[PDB]
């Protein structure tokens, strides 16, 4: 899963950087608890703006 | 000799009733077969 970081978290990357995570990690923790967003054009534009 | 048959209208009506036949989908098929054959007495 390609995902944009919404905050610093260890061993993955910086704020706003796009990482690849395991689908379970991305789907069950980060996105539901508001630490990242799915990697789409409409979300990268939202974050950059 | 209590013989095989011993009539009781209440049990007969519950077991072979028109309403009991309608309740189950299969029994409606039996009733429809009686109607198709042309039998005058559909149910007891």
């Amino acid at each position: 899963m390609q995902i944009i970081l919404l905050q610093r978290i260890v061993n993955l990357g910086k704020l706003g950087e796009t990482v690849d995570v395991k689908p379970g990690y991305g789907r069950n923790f980060l996105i539901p608890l508001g630490k990242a967003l799915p990697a789409t054009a409409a979300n990268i534009e939202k974050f950059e703006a | 000799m209590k013989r095989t048959f011993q009539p009781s209208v209440i049990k007969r009506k519950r077991t072979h009733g028109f309403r009991a036949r309608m309740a189950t989908k299969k029994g409606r098929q039996v009733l429809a077969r009686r109607r198709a054959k042309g039998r005058h007495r559909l149910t007891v």
């Binding site: 899963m1 689908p23 789907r27 996105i31 539901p32 799915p38 | -």
Partner: protein, 76 residues
């Protein structure tokens, strides 16, 4: 029933085939699992009985797209 909503997968029929080539009727059941999908557009968890391919479709297309597809399909 044991049917995947997103993709409509349902039990398949087939044959158990022995080494002597004896055939017996068998079923192939979908990998159905209960999963609570987080939906931001409604700020809530929606529980679906979904297949693994269904979860992959959630991953690829988005819970919003799949949910609107189900609502168009009917039961919601």
């Amino acid at each position: 029933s044991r049917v995947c909503q997103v993709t409509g997968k349902r039990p398949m029929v087939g044959n158990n085939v022995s080494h002597a080539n004896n055939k017996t009727r068998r079923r192939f059941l979908p990998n159905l699992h209960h999963h609570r999908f987080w939906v931001e557009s409604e700020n809530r968890f929606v529980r679906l009985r979904i297949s693994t391919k269904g979860m992959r479709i959630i991953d690829k297309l988005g819970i919003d797209k799949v949910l609107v597809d189900l609502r168009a399909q009917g039961q919601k």
